Amino acid sequence: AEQSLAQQPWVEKYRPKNLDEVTAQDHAVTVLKKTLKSANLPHMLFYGPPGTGKTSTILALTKELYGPDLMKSRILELNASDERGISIVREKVKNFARLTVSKPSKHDLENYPCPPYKIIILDEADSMTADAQSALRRTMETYSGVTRFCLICNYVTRII
């Protein structure tokens, strides 16, 4: 994996891997780092100019939280590449949110602090429709104990 990173351009080569690598936002990284020792993680809404660390800091937080083993089975990632529509937000997002958290192995349960909730990261939520964000409202509120929601955007006004 080291040769693949070395071959990759500097943008991906030096992508932050931990919460200490993002030396940009000491006001938002400490709140996420203190969530580690705690267990209450609120629904996150990262918003800001293009290229400031949002998509990188969310991946770093999910990694530092779950581990590379549980990472694949504990987080769902819906970016602008996927088809995010009212029907999709109603069916698939609710299906994954209304799910039982995966069982953490002894390795993960010993090394990484595994919280009792999954994470649905809707990246670039400023491209969603208004009806999809409307349907997301009670979806992100009822299953709040087994699922949290992290939205990422450049325009906070575009989000309802």
Partner 1 sequence: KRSKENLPWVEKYRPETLDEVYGQNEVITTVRKFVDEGKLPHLLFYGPPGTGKTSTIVALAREIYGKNYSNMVLELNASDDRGIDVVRNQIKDFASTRQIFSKGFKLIILDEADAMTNAAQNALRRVIERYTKNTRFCVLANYAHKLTPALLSRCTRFRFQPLPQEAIERRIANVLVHEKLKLSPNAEKALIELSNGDMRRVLNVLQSCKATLDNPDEDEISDDVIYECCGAPRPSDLKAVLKSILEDDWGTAHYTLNKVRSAKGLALIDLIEGIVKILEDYELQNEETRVHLLTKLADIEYSISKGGNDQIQGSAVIGAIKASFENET
Partner 2 sequence: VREEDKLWTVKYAPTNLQQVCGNKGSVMKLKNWLANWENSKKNSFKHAGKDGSGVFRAAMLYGPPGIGKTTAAHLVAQELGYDILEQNASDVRSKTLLNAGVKNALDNMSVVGYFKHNEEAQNLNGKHFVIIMDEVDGMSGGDRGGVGQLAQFCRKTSTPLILICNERNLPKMRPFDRVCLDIQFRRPDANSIKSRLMTIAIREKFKLDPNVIDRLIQTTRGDIRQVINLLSTISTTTKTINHENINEISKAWEKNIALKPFDIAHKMLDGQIYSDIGSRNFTLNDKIALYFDDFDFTPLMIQENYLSTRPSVLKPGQSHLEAVAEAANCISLGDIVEKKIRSSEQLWSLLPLHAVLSSVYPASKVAGHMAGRINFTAWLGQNSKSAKYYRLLQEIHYHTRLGTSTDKIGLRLDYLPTFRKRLLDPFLKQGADAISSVIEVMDDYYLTKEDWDSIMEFFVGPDVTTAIIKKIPATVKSGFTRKYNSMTHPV
Partner 3 sequence: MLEAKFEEASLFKRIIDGFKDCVQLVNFQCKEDGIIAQAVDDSRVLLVSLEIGVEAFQEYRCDHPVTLGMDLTSLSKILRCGNNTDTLTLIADNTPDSIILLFEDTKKDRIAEYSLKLMDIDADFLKIEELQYDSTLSLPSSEFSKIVRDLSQLSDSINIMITKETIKFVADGDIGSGSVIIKPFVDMEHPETSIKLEMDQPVDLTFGAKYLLDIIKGSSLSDRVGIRLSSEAPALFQFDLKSGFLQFFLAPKFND
Ligand X SMILES: Nc1ncnc2c1ncn2[C@@H]1O[C@H](COP(=O)(O)OP(=O)(O)OP(O)(O)=S)[C@@H](O)[C@H]1O
Which positions lie near ligand X, rule CB under 6 A?
11-12, 14-16, 21-24, 50-56, 154
What is the nearest approach in angstroms of partner 3 to the Cβ of residue 67? 17
Q: Environment class of residue 144 by beta-carbon count within 10 Å: exposed (0-12), middle (13-18) or buried (19+)?
A: middle
Count residues near partner 1 (CB under 8 A). Answer: 34
For residue 121, what is the enclosing H or E element? strand 118-122
Site stretch for partner 1 (CB under 8 A), options 13-21, 39-47, 55-63, 69-77: 39-47
Count residues near partner 3 (CB under 8 A). Answer: 8
94 lies in the binding site for partner 1 (CB under 8 A): yes
Closer CB to partner 2, 21 or 131, in the complex: 131
CA 149 to chain centre: 7
Instruction: Please list, residue by residue across 1-23, b when 16 or more beta carbons sit within 10 angstroms of its beta carbon and e when fewer do.
Output: eeeeeeeeeeeeeebbeebeebe
Binding site for partner 2 (CB under 8 A): 129-131
